[PDB]
């Protein structure tokens, strides 16, 4: 029943993101945390790359908009300057 999970905002697959999978599978009886699971490390790396790309794309689009605004300015005050 993935549609209900999607409606609730969880992953359609319970094996996706969530405590059931992203939490450590085990820990030492003494209480010491276990070394990170290989799948969890790979997933964290993938999410980090995704977030970095999100930031890069947003920054590039913002910089492009700012550059376009600056170019429109340059054009406007130029036009005015050689009009005067």
């Amino acid at each position: 029943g993935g549609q209900w999970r999607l409606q609730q905002g969880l992953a359609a697959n319970p094996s996706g993101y969530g405590p059931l999978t992203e939490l450590p599978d085990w820990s030492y009886a003494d209480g010491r945390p276990a070394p990170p699971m290989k799948g969890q490390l790979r997933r964290k790396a993938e999410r980090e790359t995704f977030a970095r790309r999100v930031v890069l794309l947003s920054q590039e689009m913002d910089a492009g908009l700012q550059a376009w605004q600056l170019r429109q300015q340059k054009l406007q005050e130029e036009q005015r300057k050689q009009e005067n």
Binding site: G1, W4, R5, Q8, G9, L10, P14, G18, P19, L20
Partner: protein, 140 residues
């Protein structure tokens, strides 16, 4: 005959050992044993997908049996357990049905409870208070 093969006995045996449990000459003659053994190995490789599929089918059948014993249908039980947010898989559900009948009865009662809560919500559609079990724990 400068160079001659001296291991042909062992090369043949490497296949005849896997062919020993066949029928007829397929377990004795290499010309036949090799073909039969290749087919057997291909079947063994392809049989893992079928093993998983048949395991899931058997689990679904047993869960259906237990749910019918308790008056529920398998789709209702599975969907309502998911809605209750109990993520027991089909293997574990069948194991509980076989070996923990009282626990499976409790799970079926929970599934029917959630099903009736959903029916009540649909019937009295609106902003009526959410069902007690219908409430979903939120993780962040």
């Amino acid at each position: 005959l400068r160079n001659r093969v001296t291991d042909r006995y062992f090369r043949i045996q490497e296949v005849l050992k896997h062919a020993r449990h066949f029928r007829g000459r397929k377990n004795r003659c290499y010309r036949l044993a090799v073909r039969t053994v290749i087919r057997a190995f291909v079947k063994c490789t392809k049989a893992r997908y079928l093993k998983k599929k048949n395991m899931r089918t058997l689990w679904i059948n047993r869960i259906t049996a237990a749910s019918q014993e308790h008056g529920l249908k398998y789709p209702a039980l599975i969907g309502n357990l998911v809605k209750c947010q109990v993520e027991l898989n089909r293997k574990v559900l069948a194991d509980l049905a076989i070996y923990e009948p009282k626990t499976f009865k409790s799970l079926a009662a929970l599934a029917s409870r959630r099903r009736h809560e959903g029916f009540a919500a649909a019937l009295g559609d609106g902003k009526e208070p959410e069902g007690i079990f219908s409430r979903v724990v939120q993780y962040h």
